[PDB]
Design a protein around this ligand. Structure first.
Ligand SMILES: *[C@@H]1O[C@H](CO)[C@@H](O[C@@H]2O[C@H](CO)[C@@H](O)[C@H](O)[C@H]2NC(C)=O)[C@H](O)[C@H]1NC(C)=O
Ligand code: NAG
Ligand code: CL
Ligand code: CL
Ligand code: CL
Ligand code: CL
Ligand code: CL
Ligand code: CL
Ligand code: CO
Lengths: 215, 233, 212
């Protein structure tokens, strides 16, 4: 199947450049162009540019002074580099496959996106605290004081998804983020079933498993 | 605020450039064509590129050709039908690849031509009794058509009040304007035009009722000529 | 640039209703793409070139339009259609997107299930106390959550977060987090969150006694 996966640094300083990679499978870059599109937090989509199958590029003229693109056909990778970074370059960055039809072009397969925060602040890993359950019981994990976004939270290695609510993070007055992830489970199962939240904060290389049990 | 041409739209402009370079048309619309080429062909379709495409399609190319005269991605289905409809939306010509022809069907007009001297002769020449060696006429009364076979295409044939179809081993196309018959010009170490061509005049309509040909009547050895006019309508 | 203005910004619809969202372009374009995006996921191609449904898109969706005015229509809305829909033009450089129409699904009122979580002993050892009140699977989204510490209403020391609308049951969930120093936390005994919501016949309070 056609697949695209972005990879990049979750945090970059305003003085540095941003380098992001799009790795593809299921098709050849010799036959398909690749677009970059970004989405600032809670904001709409913005096209950045494209590298066509033959290697030529076209950038959004509103940022062509700062943006460049290249690719490595043999590695099935396309590269984005942006310099003179500003705070408003904070966004989720997507790559998407270009499609050619007789009477239109399209962007027919998209990656999952990679999060980029532009800030001079230092990374900080979260502390993970249990929200202990005390017919339906709720339990969770408090994921507190981390920077930048995002963190991934799963339950039981991703096997437990029903009833899970992982809340959008809140920006605290300290400048650090915090969220909770909760799940509802049958109370009859609390003595016998195990519930562990898996927390991953890639910018700080923090991976935490925290078992949550009744007191 | 650059317009983006779709695959189909850019191909029409691509053909329009070829028609202008062939000298079948005098104008071209290339807005957006260069980006269309970079995106869909992976190359810069500059004047050198187009001249090579024309040279290859009509002369040097061998094997199957695609819609853009090359011998997921578009233009990977290489034809074997022998012709391309070089169609810009403003003008069109049915053009035959050199590989579909029994040898070369062109003449090199860059070579110095055997000069033709003027000589007294009738200003009017009858369609039924043409002594000019550059022209041969066939009348098909049954279907109300006249075909003029032009055997010396370097000698200009000017149409007046005519609506004709040109047939040649290079391209077929229609002419609806007064003046010298336009012919495809192919650059290949020099300028080439078709070796012969046919003017087809349909008289089954009324719009050719005044059609007239003006040309030099070439006669023989040393070549001689005089201005003449052949009424068709 | 071509500016794409999508109207309205939010479409609220009950299941079974027909809805239409509009994408107006600042200058004429030859066709319009549409994408569906749900929270936490990338945009999904939804309609190609004005009216062509992407593979897998239900037949209840259609697209139409020309020139400066394009639309997306859902003939009978379903709960899973809750999402933001973006239009996109490909007639002029740079490629541009609209800012999206957010389709919100209506449903019958559903009262929240309310849970309260004391600070963990591990967090207390590190000097901070976070008390979490959870409002689970409710509709409408509007709710009032106030904190009472020893029956004294709290102000300015709590933060709320709300999930996006559930794709299956169209409900929301909400957390309210009261944050206090360990010393302030250990000064008081009763910690309560009081919840007011349309589905409750009276405010519901969940509370606990510290250390009990
Ligand atoms: C078309 O005709 C021209 C003119 O006769 C040819 O140009 C000559 O080419 C020869 C071979 O290289 C040169 O030695 C001459 O000096 C050229 N003369 C001129 C006036 O250019 C041309 O080669 C011919 N093209 C083909 C494909 O036969
Ligand atoms: C025909 O047109 C050409 C080009 O304008 C001109 O040179 C010629 O004298 C005209 N007349 C004849 C009889 O060819
Ligand atoms: Cl491929
Ligand atoms: Cl560019
Ligand atoms: Cl066109
Ligand atoms: Cl045409
Ligand atoms: Cl634009
Ligand atoms: Cl309208
Ligand atoms: Co504990």
């Amino acid at each position: 199947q056609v697949q695209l996966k972005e990879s990049g640094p979750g945090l970059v300083a305003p003085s540095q450049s941003l380098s992001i990679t799009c790795t593809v499978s299921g098709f050849s870059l010799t036959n398909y162009g690749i677009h970059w599109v970004r989405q600032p937090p809670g904001k709409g989509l913005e096209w950045l540019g494209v590298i066509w199958a033959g290697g030529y590029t076209k950038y959004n003229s509103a940022l062509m002074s700062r943006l460049s693109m290249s690719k490595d056909n043999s590695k099935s990778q396309v590269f984005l580099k942006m310099n003179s970074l500003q705070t408003d370059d904070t966004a989720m960055y997507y790559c998407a496959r270009d499609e050619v039809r007789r009477d239109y072009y399209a962007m027919d397969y998209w990656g999952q996106g990679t999060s980029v925060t532009v800030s001079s602040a230092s990374t900080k890993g979260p502390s993970v605290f249990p929200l202990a359950p005390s017919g339906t019981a709720a339990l969770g994990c408090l994921v507190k004081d981390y920077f930048p976004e995002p963190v991934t939270v799963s339950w039981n290695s991703g096997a437990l998804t029903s009833g899970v609510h992982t809340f959008p993070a809140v920006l605290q007055s300290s400048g650090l983020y915090s969220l909770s992830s909760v799940v509802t489970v049958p109370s009859s199962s609390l003595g016998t079933q195990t519930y562990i939240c898996n927390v991953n904060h890639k910018p700080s290389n923090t991976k935490v498993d925290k078992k949550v049990e009744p007191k | 605020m650059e317009i983006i041409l779709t695959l189909s739209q850019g191909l029409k402009k691509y053909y329009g450039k070829i028609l202008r370079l062939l000298q079948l048309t005098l104008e071209e619309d290339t807005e957006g064509l260069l980006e269309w080429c970079k995106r869909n062909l992976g190359l810069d379709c500059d004047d050198t590129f187009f001249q090579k495409r024309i040279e290859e399609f009509f002369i040097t190319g061998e094997g199957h050709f695609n819609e853009v005269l090359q011998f997921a991605e578009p233009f990977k289905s290489y034809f074997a039908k022998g012709f391309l409809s070089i169609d810009s939306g403003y003008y069109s010509a049915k053009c035959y690849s050199g590989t579909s022809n029994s040898g070369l069907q062109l003449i090199n007009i860059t070579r110095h031509s055997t000069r033709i001297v003027d000589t007294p002769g009738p200003k009017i020449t009858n369609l039924k009794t043409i002594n000019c060696i550059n022209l041969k006429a066939s009348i098909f009364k049954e279907h109300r058509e006249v075909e003029i076979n032009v055997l010396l295409p370097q000698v200009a044939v000017n149409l007046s009040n005519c609506h004709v179809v040109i047939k040649s081993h290079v391209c077929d196309y229609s002419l609806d304007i007064d003046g010298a018959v336009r012919l495809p010009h192919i650059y290949h170490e020099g300028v080439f035009i078709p070796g012969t061509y046919k003017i087809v005049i349909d008289k089954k309509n009324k719009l050719n009722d005044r059609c007239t040909l003006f040309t030099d009547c070439v006669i023989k050895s040393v070549l001689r000529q005089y201005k003449t006019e052949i009424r068709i309508g | 640039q071509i500016v794409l203005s999508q109207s309205p910004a939010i479409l609220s619809a009950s299941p079974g209703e027909k809805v239409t969202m509009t994408c107006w372009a600042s200058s004429g374009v030859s066709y319009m793409h549409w994408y569906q995006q749900k929270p936490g996921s990338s945009p999904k191609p939804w309609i190609f070139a004005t009216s062509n449904l992407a593979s897998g898109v239900p037949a209840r969706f259609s697209g139409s339009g020309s020139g400066t005015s394009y639309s997306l229509t859902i003939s009978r809305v379903e709960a899973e259609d809750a999402a933001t829909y973006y239009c996109q033009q490909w007639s002029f450089n740079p490629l541009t997107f609209g800012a999206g129409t957010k389709l919100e699904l209506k449903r019958t009122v559903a009262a929240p299930s309310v849970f309260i979580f004391p600070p963990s002993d591990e967090q207390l050892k590190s000097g901070t106390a976070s008390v979490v009140c959870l409002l689970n699977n409710f509709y409408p989204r509007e709710a009032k959550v106030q904190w009472k510490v020893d029956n004294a209403l709290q102000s300015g020391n709590s933060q709320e977060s709300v999930t996006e609308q559930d794709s299956k049951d169209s409900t929301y969930s909400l957390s309210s987090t009261l944050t206090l120093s360990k010393a302030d936390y250990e000064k008081h005994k009763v910690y309560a969150c009081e919840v007011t919501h349309q589905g409750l016949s009276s405010p519901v309070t969940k509370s606990f006694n510290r250390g009990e």
